[PDB]
PDB file of all heavy atoms in Angstrom:
ATOM      1  N   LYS T   1      15.341  -9.990   0.904  1.00  0.00           N
ATOM      2  CA  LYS T   1      14.553 -10.025   2.128  1.00  0.00           C
ATOM      3  C   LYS T   1      13.246 -10.726   1.767  1.00  0.00           C
ATOM      4  O   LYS T   1      12.254 -10.642   2.493  1.00  0.00           O
ATOM      5  CB  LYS T   1      14.254  -8.600   2.607  1.00  0.00           C
ATOM      6  CG  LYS T   1      15.485  -7.723   2.793  1.00  0.00           C
ATOM      7  CD  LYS T   1      16.429  -8.288   3.842  1.00  0.00           C
ATOM      8  CE  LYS T   1      17.638  -7.385   4.040  1.00  0.00           C
ATOM      9  NZ  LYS T   1      17.248  -6.016   4.495  1.00  0.00           N
ATOM     10  N   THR T   2      13.261 -11.421   0.634  1.00  0.00           N
ATOM     11  CA  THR T   2      12.077 -12.113   0.145  1.00  0.00           C
ATOM     12  C   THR T   2      12.144 -13.628   0.276  1.00  0.00           C
ATOM     13  O   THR T   2      13.136 -14.255  -0.100  1.00  0.00           O
ATOM     14  CB  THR T   2      11.830 -11.787  -1.341  1.00  0.00           C
ATOM     15  OG1 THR T   2      11.773 -10.366  -1.515  1.00  0.00           O
ATOM     16  CG2 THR T   2      10.524 -12.406  -1.817  1.00  0.00           C
ATOM     17  N   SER T   3      11.074 -14.209   0.811  1.00  0.00           N
ATOM     18  CA  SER T   3      10.971 -15.654   0.950  1.00  0.00           C
ATOM     19  C   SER T   3      10.352 -16.122  -0.362  1.00  0.00           C
ATOM     20  O   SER T   3       9.248 -15.709  -0.718  1.00  0.00           O
ATOM     21  CB  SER T   3      10.061 -16.012   2.128  1.00  0.00           C
ATOM     22  OG  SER T   3      10.628 -15.586   3.357  1.00  0.00           O
ATOM     23  N   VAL T   4      11.068 -16.972  -1.089  1.00  0.00           N
ATOM     24  CA  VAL T   4      10.584 -17.452  -2.377  1.00  0.00           C
ATOM     25  C   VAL T   4      10.137 -18.910  -2.357  1.00  0.00           C
ATOM     26  O   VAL T   4      10.917 -19.806  -2.033  1.00  0.00           O
ATOM     27  CB  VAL T   4      11.670 -17.287  -3.465  1.00  0.00           C
ATOM     28  CG1 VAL T   4      11.122 -17.712  -4.819  1.00  0.00           C
ATOM     29  CG2 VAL T   4      12.151 -15.844  -3.503  1.00  0.00           C
ATOM     30  N   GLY T   5       8.875 -19.135  -2.708  1.00  0.00           N
ATOM     31  CA  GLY T   5       8.338 -20.483  -2.750  1.00  0.00           C
ATOM     32  C   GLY T   5       7.858 -20.789  -4.156  1.00  0.00           C
ATOM     33  O   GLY T   5       8.446 -20.326  -5.132  1.00  0.00           O
ATOM     34  N   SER T   6       6.795 -21.577  -4.271  1.00  0.00           N
ATOM     35  CA  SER T   6       6.247 -21.901  -5.581  1.00  0.00           C
ATOM     36  C   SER T   6       5.612 -20.626  -6.125  1.00  0.00           C
ATOM     37  O   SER T   6       5.358 -19.687  -5.368  1.00  0.00           O
ATOM     38  CB  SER T   6       5.178 -22.984  -5.454  1.00  0.00           C
ATOM     39  OG  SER T   6       4.090 -22.506  -4.682  1.00  0.00           O
ATOM     40  N   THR T   7       5.357 -20.586  -7.428  1.00  0.00           N
ATOM     41  CA  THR T   7       4.740 -19.408  -8.017  1.00  0.00           C
ATOM     42  C   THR T   7       3.383 -19.150  -7.364  1.00  0.00           C
ATOM     43  O   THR T   7       3.002 -18.000  -7.146  1.00  0.00           O
ATOM     44  CB  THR T   7       4.586 -19.564  -9.543  1.00  0.00           C
ATOM     45  OG1 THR T   7       5.884 -19.524 -10.154  1.00  0.00           O
ATOM     46  CG2 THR T   7       3.734 -18.441 -10.118  1.00  0.00           C
ATOM     47  N   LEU T   8       2.662 -20.218  -7.036  1.00  0.00           N
ATOM     48  CA  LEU T   8       1.364 -20.074  -6.384  1.00  0.00           C
ATOM     49  C   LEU T   8       1.547 -19.346  -5.055  1.00  0.00           C
ATOM     50  O   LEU T   8       0.833 -18.389  -4.750  1.00  0.00           O
ATOM     51  CB  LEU T   8       0.734 -21.449  -6.134  1.00  0.00           C
ATOM     52  CG  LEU T   8      -0.592 -21.443  -5.366  1.00  0.00           C
ATOM     53  CD1 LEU T   8      -1.637 -20.653  -6.142  1.00  0.00           C
ATOM     54  CD2 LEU T   8      -1.061 -22.878  -5.143  1.00  0.00           C
ATOM     55  N   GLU T   9       2.510 -19.806  -4.262  1.00  0.00           N
ATOM     56  CA  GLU T   9       2.788 -19.196  -2.970  1.00  0.00           C
ATOM     57  C   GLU T   9       3.267 -17.757  -3.135  1.00  0.00           C
ATOM     58  O   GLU T   9       2.947 -16.895  -2.321  1.00  0.00           O
ATOM     59  CB  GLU T   9       3.840 -20.018  -2.221  1.00  0.00           C
ATOM     60  CG  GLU T   9       3.413 -21.466  -2.016  1.00  0.00           C
ATOM     61  CD  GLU T   9       4.465 -22.314  -1.326  1.00  0.00           C
ATOM     62  OE1 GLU T   9       5.655 -22.220  -1.698  1.00  0.00           O
ATOM     63  OE2 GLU T   9       4.092 -23.092  -0.418  1.00  0.00           O
ATOM     64  N   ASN T  10       4.028 -17.501  -4.196  1.00  0.00           N
ATOM     65  CA  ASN T  10       4.544 -16.160  -4.443  1.00  0.00           C
ATOM     66  C   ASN T  10       3.430 -15.208  -4.850  1.00  0.00           C
ATOM     67  O   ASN T  10       3.433 -14.044  -4.456  1.00  0.00           O
ATOM     68  CB  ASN T  10       5.638 -16.198  -5.511  1.00  0.00           C
ATOM     69  CG  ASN T  10       6.833 -17.030  -5.083  1.00  0.00           C
ATOM     70  OD1 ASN T  10       7.098 -17.182  -3.889  1.00  0.00           O
ATOM     71  ND2 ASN T  10       7.568 -17.561  -6.054  1.00  0.00           N
ATOM     72  N   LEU T  11       2.477 -15.702  -5.636  1.00  0.00           N
ATOM     73  CA  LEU T  11       1.350 -14.871  -6.045  1.00  0.00           C
ATOM     74  C   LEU T  11       0.560 -14.472  -4.799  1.00  0.00           C
ATOM     75  O   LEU T  11       0.137 -13.324  -4.661  1.00  0.00           O
ATOM     76  CB  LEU T  11       0.448 -15.633  -7.023  1.00  0.00           C
ATOM     77  CG  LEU T  11       0.919 -15.688  -8.479  1.00  0.00           C
ATOM     78  CD1 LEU T  11       0.178 -16.790  -9.221  1.00  0.00           C
ATOM     79  CD2 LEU T  11       0.686 -14.330  -9.144  1.00  0.00           C
ATOM     80  N   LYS T  12       0.374 -15.419  -3.883  1.00  0.00           N
ATOM     81  CA  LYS T  12      -0.356 -15.139  -2.652  1.00  0.00           C
ATOM     82  C   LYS T  12       0.407 -14.149  -1.786  1.00  0.00           C
ATOM     83  O   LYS T  12      -0.187 -13.265  -1.168  1.00  0.00           O
ATOM     84  CB  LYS T  12      -0.592 -16.427  -1.864  1.00  0.00           C
ATOM     85  CG  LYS T  12      -1.528 -17.413  -2.535  1.00  0.00           C
ATOM     86  CD  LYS T  12      -1.679 -18.662  -1.684  1.00  0.00           C
ATOM     87  CE  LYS T  12      -2.547 -19.701  -2.362  1.00  0.00           C
ATOM     88  NZ  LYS T  12      -2.670 -20.927  -1.522  1.00  0.00           N
ATOM     89  N   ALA T  13       1.726 -14.300  -1.736  1.00  0.00           N
ATOM     90  CA  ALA T  13       2.561 -13.407  -0.941  1.00  0.00           C
ATOM     91  C   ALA T  13       2.491 -11.996  -1.518  1.00  0.00           C
ATOM     92  O   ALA T  13       2.450 -11.012  -0.777  1.00  0.00           O
ATOM     93  CB  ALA T  13       4.004 -13.905  -0.931  1.00  0.00           C
ATOM     94  N   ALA T  14       2.474 -11.903  -2.844  1.00  0.00           N
ATOM     95  CA  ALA T  14       2.402 -10.604  -3.501  1.00  0.00           C
ATOM     96  C   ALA T  14       1.062  -9.943  -3.184  1.00  0.00           C
ATOM     97  O   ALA T  14       1.010  -8.758  -2.863  1.00  0.00           O
ATOM     98  CB  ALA T  14       2.572 -10.768  -5.003  1.00  0.00           C
ATOM     99  N   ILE T  15      -0.019 -10.711  -3.266  1.00  0.00           N
ATOM    100  CA  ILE T  15      -1.340 -10.172  -2.968  1.00  0.00           C
ATOM    101  C   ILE T  15      -1.391  -9.647  -1.536  1.00  0.00           C
ATOM    102  O   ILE T  15      -1.952  -8.580  -1.276  1.00  0.00           O
ATOM    103  CB  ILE T  15      -2.433 -11.241  -3.171  1.00  0.00           C
ATOM    104  CG1 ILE T  15      -2.615 -11.504  -4.665  1.00  0.00           C
ATOM    105  CG2 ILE T  15      -3.750 -10.782  -2.549  1.00  0.00           C
ATOM    106  CD1 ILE T  15      -3.524 -12.676  -4.971  1.00  0.00           C
ATOM    107  N   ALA T  16      -0.800 -10.392  -0.607  1.00  0.00           N
ATOM    108  CA  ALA T  16      -0.777  -9.975   0.791  1.00  0.00           C
ATOM    109  C   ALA T  16      -0.038  -8.643   0.902  1.00  0.00           C
ATOM    110  O   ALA T  16      -0.478  -7.731   1.604  1.00  0.00           O
ATOM    111  CB  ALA T  16      -0.090 -11.037   1.646  1.00  0.00           C
ATOM    112  N   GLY T  17       1.086  -8.538   0.197  1.00  0.00           N
ATOM    113  CA  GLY T  17       1.861  -7.308   0.222  1.00  0.00           C
ATOM    114  C   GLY T  17       1.114  -6.150  -0.413  1.00  0.00           C
ATOM    115  O   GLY T  17       1.157  -5.024   0.085  1.00  0.00           O
ATOM    116  N   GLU T  18       0.431  -6.430  -1.519  1.00  0.00           N
ATOM    117  CA  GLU T  18      -0.343  -5.420  -2.233  1.00  0.00           C
ATOM    118  C   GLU T  18      -1.492  -4.931  -1.359  1.00  0.00           C
ATOM    119  O   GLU T  18      -1.826  -3.744  -1.351  1.00  0.00           O
ATOM    120  CB  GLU T  18      -0.896  -5.971  -3.546  1.00  0.00           C
ATOM    121  CG  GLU T  18       0.151  -6.339  -4.573  1.00  0.00           C
ATOM    122  CD  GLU T  18       0.681  -5.112  -5.291  1.00  0.00           C
ATOM    123  OE1 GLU T  18       0.024  -4.059  -5.216  1.00  0.00           O
ATOM    124  OE2 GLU T  18       1.748  -5.217  -5.932  1.00  0.00           O
ATOM    125  N   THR T  19      -2.106  -5.866  -0.642  1.00  0.00           N
ATOM    126  CA  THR T  19      -3.220  -5.548   0.239  1.00  0.00           C
ATOM    127  C   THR T  19      -2.716  -4.641   1.354  1.00  0.00           C
ATOM    128  O   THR T  19      -3.390  -3.688   1.748  1.00  0.00           O
ATOM    129  CB  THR T  19      -3.833  -6.835   0.829  1.00  0.00           C
ATOM    130  OG1 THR T  19      -4.257  -7.688  -0.241  1.00  0.00           O
ATOM    131  CG2 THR T  19      -5.037  -6.508   1.700  1.00  0.00           C
ATOM    132  N   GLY T  20      -1.520  -4.937   1.856  1.00  0.00           N
ATOM    133  CA  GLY T  20      -0.946  -4.111   2.901  1.00  0.00           C
ATOM    134  C   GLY T  20      -0.645  -2.725   2.360  1.00  0.00           C
ATOM    135  O   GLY T  20      -0.866  -1.722   3.037  1.00  0.00           O
ATOM    136  N   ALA T  21      -0.145  -2.666   1.129  1.00  0.00           N
ATOM    137  CA  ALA T  21       0.184  -1.390   0.500  1.00  0.00           C
ATOM    138  C   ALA T  21      -1.070  -0.540   0.311  1.00  0.00           C
ATOM    139  O   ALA T  21      -1.056   0.665   0.569  1.00  0.00           O
ATOM    140  CB  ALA T  21       0.870  -1.626  -0.846  1.00  0.00           C
ATOM    141  N   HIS T  22      -2.154  -1.167  -0.134  1.00  0.00           N
ATOM    142  CA  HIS T  22      -3.397  -0.437  -0.341  1.00  0.00           C
ATOM    143  C   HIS T  22      -3.904   0.164   0.967  1.00  0.00           C
ATOM    144  O   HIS T  22      -4.350   1.312   0.999  1.00  0.00           O
ATOM    145  CB  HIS T  22      -4.465  -1.354  -0.940  1.00  0.00           C
ATOM    146  CG  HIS T  22      -5.785  -0.680  -1.139  1.00  0.00           C
ATOM    147  ND1 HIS T  22      -6.712  -0.545  -0.128  1.00  0.00           N
ATOM    148  CD2 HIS T  22      -6.307  -0.047  -2.217  1.00  0.00           C
ATOM    149  CE1 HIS T  22      -7.748   0.143  -0.573  1.00  0.00           C
ATOM    150  NE2 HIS T  22      -7.527   0.457  -1.838  1.00  0.00           N
ATOM    151  N   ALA T  23      -3.833  -0.611   2.046  1.00  0.00           N
ATOM    152  CA  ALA T  23      -4.284  -0.133   3.351  1.00  0.00           C
ATOM    153  C   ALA T  23      -3.376   0.996   3.821  1.00  0.00           C
ATOM    154  O   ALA T  23      -3.831   1.990   4.386  1.00  0.00           O
ATOM    155  CB  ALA T  23      -4.266  -1.272   4.363  1.00  0.00           C
ATOM    156  N   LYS T  24      -2.084   0.822   3.576  1.00  0.00           N
ATOM    157  CA  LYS T  24      -1.076   1.803   3.952  1.00  0.00           C
ATOM    158  C   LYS T  24      -1.329   3.139   3.256  1.00  0.00           C
ATOM    159  O   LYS T  24      -1.422   4.185   3.902  1.00  0.00           O
ATOM    160  CB  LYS T  24       0.299   1.261   3.571  1.00  0.00           C
ATOM    161  CG  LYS T  24       1.474   2.172   3.850  1.00  0.00           C
ATOM    162  CD  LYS T  24       2.751   1.463   3.423  1.00  0.00           C
ATOM    163  CE  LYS T  24       3.990   2.311   3.625  1.00  0.00           C
ATOM    164  NZ  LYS T  24       5.205   1.537   3.247  1.00  0.00           N
ATOM    165  N   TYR T  25      -1.457   3.098   1.935  1.00  0.00           N
ATOM    166  CA  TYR T  25      -1.676   4.310   1.159  1.00  0.00           C
ATOM    167  C   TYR T  25      -3.020   4.958   1.450  1.00  0.00           C
ATOM    168  O   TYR T  25      -3.146   6.182   1.403  1.00  0.00           O
ATOM    169  CB  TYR T  25      -1.519   3.992  -0.330  1.00  0.00           C
ATOM    170  CG  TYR T  25      -0.115   3.526  -0.680  1.00  0.00           C
ATOM    171  CD1 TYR T  25       0.143   2.842  -1.865  1.00  0.00           C
ATOM    172  CD2 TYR T  25       0.958   3.776   0.181  1.00  0.00           C
ATOM    173  CE1 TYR T  25       1.437   2.414  -2.183  1.00  0.00           C
ATOM    174  CE2 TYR T  25       2.249   3.356  -0.128  1.00  0.00           C
ATOM    175  CZ  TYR T  25       2.479   2.677  -1.308  1.00  0.00           C
ATOM    176  OH  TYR T  25       3.757   2.261  -1.606  1.00  0.00           O
ATOM    177  N   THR T  26      -4.024   4.144   1.756  1.00  0.00           N
ATOM    178  CA  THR T  26      -5.336   4.681   2.080  1.00  0.00           C
ATOM    179  C   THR T  26      -5.209   5.471   3.379  1.00  0.00           C
ATOM    180  O   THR T  26      -5.770   6.560   3.511  1.00  0.00           O
ATOM    181  CB  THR T  26      -6.369   3.549   2.238  1.00  0.00           C
ATOM    182  OG1 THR T  26      -6.601   2.954   0.956  1.00  0.00           O
ATOM    183  CG2 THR T  26      -7.688   4.085   2.794  1.00  0.00           C
ATOM    184  N   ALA T  27      -4.451   4.925   4.325  1.00  0.00           N
ATOM    185  CA  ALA T  27      -4.236   5.590   5.607  1.00  0.00           C
ATOM    186  C   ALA T  27      -3.399   6.853   5.413  1.00  0.00           C
ATOM    187  O   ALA T  27      -3.648   7.875   6.052  1.00  0.00           O
ATOM    188  CB  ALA T  27      -3.538   4.643   6.580  1.00  0.00           C
ATOM    189  N   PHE T  28      -2.407   6.783   4.528  1.00  0.00           N
ATOM    190  CA  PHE T  28      -1.550   7.936   4.268  1.00  0.00           C
ATOM    191  C   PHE T  28      -2.328   9.068   3.602  1.00  0.00           C
ATOM    192  O   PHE T  28      -2.052  10.247   3.840  1.00  0.00           O
ATOM    193  CB  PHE T  28      -0.361   7.535   3.387  1.00  0.00           C
ATOM    194  CG  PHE T  28       0.669   6.684   4.089  1.00  0.00           C
ATOM    195  CD1 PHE T  28       0.522   6.324   5.429  1.00  0.00           C
ATOM    196  CD2 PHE T  28       1.802   6.253   3.407  1.00  0.00           C
ATOM    197  CE1 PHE T  28       1.491   5.552   6.073  1.00  0.00           C
ATOM    198  CE2 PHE T  28       2.773   5.482   4.043  1.00  0.00           C
ATOM    199  CZ  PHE T  28       2.618   5.132   5.376  1.00  0.00           C
ATOM    200  N   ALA T  29      -3.300   8.709   2.767  1.00  0.00           N
ATOM    201  CA  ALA T  29      -4.121   9.707   2.091  1.00  0.00           C
ATOM    202  C   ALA T  29      -4.984  10.418   3.127  1.00  0.00           C
ATOM    203  O   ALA T  29      -5.108  11.640   3.106  1.00  0.00           O
ATOM    204  CB  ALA T  29      -4.998   9.041   1.036  1.00  0.00           C
ATOM    205  N   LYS T  30      -5.578   9.645   4.033  1.00  0.00           N
ATOM    206  CA  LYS T  30      -6.418  10.206   5.086  1.00  0.00           C
ATOM    207  C   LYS T  30      -5.600  11.204   5.896  1.00  0.00           C
ATOM    208  O   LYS T  30      -6.033  12.330   6.143  1.00  0.00           O
ATOM    209  CB  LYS T  30      -6.924   9.093   6.011  1.00  0.00           C
ATOM    210  CG  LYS T  30      -7.747   9.581   7.205  1.00  0.00           C
ATOM    211  CD  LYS T  30      -8.153   8.416   8.109  1.00  0.00           C
ATOM    212  CE  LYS T  30      -8.944   8.883   9.330  1.00  0.00           C
ATOM    213  NZ  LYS T  30      -8.134   9.719  10.268  1.00  0.00           N
ATOM    214  N   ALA T  31      -4.408  10.784   6.305  1.00  0.00           N
ATOM    215  CA  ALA T  31      -3.531  11.642   7.086  1.00  0.00           C
ATOM    216  C   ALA T  31      -3.119  12.871   6.281  1.00  0.00           C
ATOM    217  O   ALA T  31      -3.111  13.987   6.800  1.00  0.00           O
ATOM    218  CB  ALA T  31      -2.296  10.862   7.527  1.00  0.00           C
ATOM    219  N   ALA T  32      -2.791  12.668   5.009  1.00  0.00           N
ATOM    220  CA  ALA T  32      -2.375  13.774   4.156  1.00  0.00           C
ATOM    221  C   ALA T  32      -3.432  14.874   4.125  1.00  0.00           C
ATOM    222  O   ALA T  32      -3.110  16.059   4.220  1.00  0.00           O
ATOM    223  CB  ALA T  32      -2.092  13.272   2.746  1.00  0.00           C
ATOM    224  N   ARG T  33      -4.696  14.485   4.002  1.00  0.00           N
ATOM    225  CA  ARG T  33      -5.772  15.469   3.968  1.00  0.00           C
ATOM    226  C   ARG T  33      -5.879  16.215   5.293  1.00  0.00           C
ATOM    227  O   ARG T  33      -6.054  17.432   5.312  1.00  0.00           O
ATOM    228  CB  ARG T  33      -7.101  14.792   3.618  1.00  0.00           C
ATOM    229  CG  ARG T  33      -7.167  14.355   2.164  1.00  0.00           C
ATOM    230  CD  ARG T  33      -8.461  13.641   1.808  1.00  0.00           C
ATOM    231  NE  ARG T  33      -8.449  13.203   0.413  1.00  0.00           N
ATOM    232  CZ  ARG T  33      -8.473  14.026  -0.630  1.00  0.00           C
ATOM    233  NH1 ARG T  33      -8.520  15.338  -0.441  1.00  0.00           N
ATOM    234  NH2 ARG T  33      -8.434  13.542  -1.864  1.00  0.00           N
ATOM    235  N   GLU T  34      -5.753  15.489   6.400  1.00  0.00           N
ATOM    236  CA  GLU T  34      -5.834  16.103   7.722  1.00  0.00           C
ATOM    237  C   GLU T  34      -4.633  17.019   7.928  1.00  0.00           C
ATOM    238  O   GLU T  34      -4.708  18.014   8.653  1.00  0.00           O
ATOM    239  CB  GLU T  34      -5.846  15.022   8.803  1.00  0.00           C
ATOM    240  CG  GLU T  34      -6.827  13.898   8.524  1.00  0.00           C
ATOM    241  CD  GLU T  34      -6.758  12.777   9.547  1.00  0.00           C
ATOM    242  OE1 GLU T  34      -5.635  12.361   9.916  1.00  0.00           O
ATOM    243  OE2 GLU T  34      -7.833  12.301   9.968  1.00  0.00           O
ATOM    244  N   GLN T  35      -3.529  16.678   7.273  1.00  0.00           N
ATOM    245  CA  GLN T  35      -2.295  17.444   7.376  1.00  0.00           C
ATOM    246  C   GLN T  35      -2.254  18.627   6.407  1.00  0.00           C
ATOM    247  O   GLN T  35      -1.332  19.441   6.450  1.00  0.00           O
ATOM    248  CB  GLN T  35      -1.104  16.505   7.155  1.00  0.00           C
ATOM    249  CG  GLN T  35      -1.094  15.356   8.158  1.00  0.00           C
ATOM    250  CD  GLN T  35      -0.174  14.214   7.774  1.00  0.00           C
ATOM    251  OE1 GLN T  35       0.019  13.922   6.592  1.00  0.00           O
ATOM    252  NE2 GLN T  35       0.378  13.540   8.777  1.00  0.00           N
ATOM    253  N   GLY T  36      -3.255  18.715   5.534  1.00  0.00           N
ATOM    254  CA  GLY T  36      -3.323  19.828   4.601  1.00  0.00           C
ATOM    255  C   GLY T  36      -2.639  19.686   3.252  1.00  0.00           C
ATOM    256  O   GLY T  36      -2.443  20.680   2.552  1.00  0.00           O
ATOM    257  N   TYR T  37      -2.272  18.466   2.878  1.00  0.00           N
ATOM    258  CA  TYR T  37      -1.627  18.242   1.586  1.00  0.00           C
ATOM    259  C   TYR T  37      -2.622  17.541   0.665  1.00  0.00           C
ATOM    260  O   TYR T  37      -2.582  16.319   0.523  1.00  0.00           O
ATOM    261  CB  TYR T  37      -0.386  17.361   1.747  1.00  0.00           C
ATOM    262  CG  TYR T  37       0.672  17.907   2.682  1.00  0.00           C
ATOM    263  CD1 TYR T  37       0.717  17.523   4.023  1.00  0.00           C
ATOM    264  CD2 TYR T  37       1.658  18.774   2.214  1.00  0.00           C
ATOM    265  CE1 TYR T  37       1.727  17.982   4.872  1.00  0.00           C
ATOM    266  CE2 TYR T  37       2.669  19.240   3.055  1.00  0.00           C
ATOM    267  CZ  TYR T  37       2.699  18.838   4.379  1.00  0.00           C
ATOM    268  OH  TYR T  37       3.717  19.277   5.200  1.00  0.00           O
ATOM    269  N   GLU T  38      -3.502  18.309   0.032  1.00  0.00           N
ATOM    270  CA  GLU T  38      -4.518  17.723  -0.839  1.00  0.00           C
ATOM    271  C   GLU T  38      -3.967  17.007  -2.065  1.00  0.00           C
ATOM    272  O   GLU T  38      -4.454  15.934  -2.419  1.00  0.00           O
ATOM    273  CB  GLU T  38      -5.547  18.786  -1.263  1.00  0.00           C
ATOM    274  CG  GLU T  38      -5.134  19.739  -2.395  1.00  0.00           C
ATOM    275  CD  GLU T  38      -5.347  19.162  -3.796  1.00  0.00           C
ATOM    276  OE1 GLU T  38      -6.345  18.436  -4.009  1.00  0.00           O
ATOM    277  OE2 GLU T  38      -4.525  19.451  -4.695  1.00  0.00           O
ATOM    278  N   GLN T  39      -2.955  17.575  -2.712  1.00  0.00           N
ATOM    279  CA  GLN T  39      -2.409  16.922  -3.895  1.00  0.00           C
ATOM    280  C   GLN T  39      -1.707  15.623  -3.533  1.00  0.00           C
ATOM    281  O   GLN T  39      -1.862  14.619  -4.223  1.00  0.00           O
ATOM    282  CB  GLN T  39      -1.443  17.837  -4.649  1.00  0.00           C
ATOM    283  CG  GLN T  39      -0.855  17.172  -5.888  1.00  0.00           C
ATOM    284  CD  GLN T  39      -0.047  18.122  -6.742  1.00  0.00           C
ATOM    285  OE1 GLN T  39       0.818  18.840  -6.244  1.00  0.00           O
ATOM    286  NE2 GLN T  39      -0.318  18.125  -8.043  1.00  0.00           N
ATOM    287  N   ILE T  40      -0.937  15.634  -2.451  1.00  0.00           N
ATOM    288  CA  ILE T  40      -0.248  14.418  -2.044  1.00  0.00           C
ATOM    289  C   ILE T  40      -1.280  13.365  -1.657  1.00  0.00           C
ATOM    290  O   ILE T  40      -1.088  12.179  -1.915  1.00  0.00           O
ATOM    291  CB  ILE T  40       0.721  14.691  -0.877  1.00  0.00           C
ATOM    292  CG1 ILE T  40       1.900  15.513  -1.397  1.00  0.00           C
ATOM    293  CG2 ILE T  40       1.204  13.379  -0.267  1.00  0.00           C
ATOM    294  CD1 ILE T  40       2.877  15.942  -0.329  1.00  0.00           C
ATOM    295  N   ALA T  41      -2.382  13.799  -1.053  1.00  0.00           N
ATOM    296  CA  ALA T  41      -3.436  12.869  -0.669  1.00  0.00           C
ATOM    297  C   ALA T  41      -3.949  12.176  -1.929  1.00  0.00           C
ATOM    298  O   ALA T  41      -4.171  10.964  -1.936  1.00  0.00           O
ATOM    299  CB  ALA T  41      -4.575  13.615   0.016  1.00  0.00           C
ATOM    300  N   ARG T  42      -4.138  12.952  -2.992  1.00  0.00           N
ATOM    301  CA  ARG T  42      -4.617  12.400  -4.256  1.00  0.00           C
ATOM    302  C   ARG T  42      -3.614  11.406  -4.842  1.00  0.00           C
ATOM    303  O   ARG T  42      -4.008  10.414  -5.457  1.00  0.00           O
ATOM    304  CB  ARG T  42      -4.909  13.522  -5.260  1.00  0.00           C
ATOM    305  CG  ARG T  42      -6.134  14.353  -4.892  1.00  0.00           C
ATOM    306  CD  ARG T  42      -6.542  15.339  -5.988  1.00  0.00           C
ATOM    307  NE  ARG T  42      -5.638  16.480  -6.134  1.00  0.00           N
ATOM    308  CZ  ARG T  42      -4.784  16.646  -7.140  1.00  0.00           C
ATOM    309  NH1 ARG T  42      -4.697  15.744  -8.113  1.00  0.00           N
ATOM    310  NH2 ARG T  42      -4.017  17.725  -7.182  1.00  0.00           N
TER     311      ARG T  42
END
């Protein structure tokens, strides 16, 4: 399910994905705390 281009393009695609993951997990941590799961939030 991956579009493969030059290594330069792939590095950029990975960064975009990583950036999305960081935002995702940051949001999940916020929710986890509101939901009462402190360890999972960590």
Side-chain angles (χ1 to χ4, degrees):
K1 305 299 181 60
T2 306
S3 295
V4 183
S6 63
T7 290
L8 176 61
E9 302 178 315
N10 298 334
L11 280 163
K12 293 179 183 179
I15 288 172
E18 295 281 343
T19 302
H22 178 277
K24 178 179 178 177
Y25 297 162
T26 291
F28 289 359
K30 176 183 178 294
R33 288 178 182 292
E34 312 176 316
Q35 302 165 327
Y37 302 95
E38 79 83 36
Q39 180 172 49
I40 290 176
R42 290 188 288 107

